[PDB]
């Protein structure tokens, strides 16, 4: 339910 | 108050996720900031902290309020000092995905991190503590940890080694218990 924040992990 | 954790070196991600899941009452992640406009189903303050203005957030980065920031998909993202402090003041250890550069920034913020480097003994050793990576990536990663240790050695609260990841997780676990 909490976001996976993929953008964030993906960030360089 | 609980010290934030930074694990560096091979396996950091696995170690971090394991810790989070395995002891969610002991460990937490902080809420990152983004300038990307909030999707309707998203919750401000839980999923991300959503900044109205890219100029706004650039200022805070300028103003030093963030320990880490970068751009992705044309939007800013970052970890604020304040969002780390909220976790840590929750009595929880804040699991951080950040560069070793962030540690000087954390020290500087009075937030006294626990910084753990995972030191591979050999190229081959990397492959034995990591199942799912290729030989080329193992190479790229051994050289990586070397350059990291050369530069950042003085920042490490501790350094662990091991034959198996399991051994290492155990070691990382001890170190954390020892500092509290």
UniProtKB/Swiss-Prot annotation, chain A:
Top-level taxon of origin: Eukaryota
Residues found modified as Phosphoserine: 7
Cellular localisation: Cytoplasm
Post-translational changes noted in the entry: Phosphorylated at Ser-7 by PRKCI. Phosphorylation is enhanced during cell polarization induced by calcium. Phosphorylation may occur during the cell-cell contact-induced cell polarization and may contribute to the segregation of LLGL2 from the PRKCI/aPKC and PARD6B/Par-6 complex.
Phenotype for residue 3 to A: Decrease of phosphorylation
Family: Belongs to the WD repeat L(2)GL family.
Assembly with partners or alone: Interacts with GPSM2/LGN, PRKCI/aPKC and PARD6B/Par-6. The complex is enhanced during mitosis. Interacts with DCAF1.
Function statement: Part of a complex with GPSM2/LGN, PRKCI/aPKC and PARD6B/Par-6, which may ensure the correct organization and orientation of bipolar spindles for normal cell division. This complex plays roles in the initial phase of the establishment of epithelial cell polarity.
More about this protein: Overexpression of LLGL2 inhibits the tight junction formation.
The protein's name in its UniProt record: LLGL scribble cell polarity complex component 2
Organism: Homo sapiens
Residues of the full protein shown: 647 to 657 of 1020
Curated annotation (Swiss-Prot), chain B:
Superkingdom per UniProt: Eukaryota
Compartment(s): Cell membrane; Postsynaptic density; Synapse; Cytoplasm
Disulphide bridges: none
Post-translational modification as stated in the protein's UniProt record: Palmitoylated. Palmitoylation is required for targeting to postsynaptic density, plasma membrane and synapses. Palmitoylation by ZDHHC2 occurs when the synaptic activity decreases and induces DLG4 synaptic clustering. Palmitoylation by ZDHHC15 regulates trafficking to the postsynaptic density and function in synaptogenesis. Palmitoylation may play a role in glutamate receptor GRIA1 synapse clustering. Depalmitoylated by ABHD17A and ABHD17B and to a lesser extent by ABHD17C, ABHD12, ABHD13, LYPLA1 and LYPLA2. Ubiquitinated by MDM2 in response to NMDA receptor activation, leading to proteasome-mediated degradation of DLG4 which is required for AMPA receptor endocytosis.
Oligomer and partners: Interacts through its PDZ domains with ANO2 and NETO1. Interacts with KCNJ4. Interacts through its first two PDZ domains with GRIN2A, GRIN2B, GRIN2C and GRIN2D. Interacts with ERBB4. Interacts with KCNA1, KCNA2, KCNA3 and KCNA4. Interacts with LRRC4 and LRRC4B. Interacts with SYNGAP1. Interacts with ASIC3. Interacts with SEMA4C. Interacts with CXADR. Interacts with KCND2. Interacts (via first PDZ domain) with CRIPT. Interacts through its first PDZ domain with GRIK2 and KCNA4. Interacts through its second PDZ domain with the PDZ domain of NOS1 or the C-terminus of CAPON.
Family: Belongs to the MAGUK family.
Name used for this protein in its record: Disks large homolog 4
Native source species: Rattus norvegicus
Lineage: Eukaryota, Metazoa, Chordata, Craniata, Vertebrata
Portion of the full sequence shown: 533 to 712 of 724
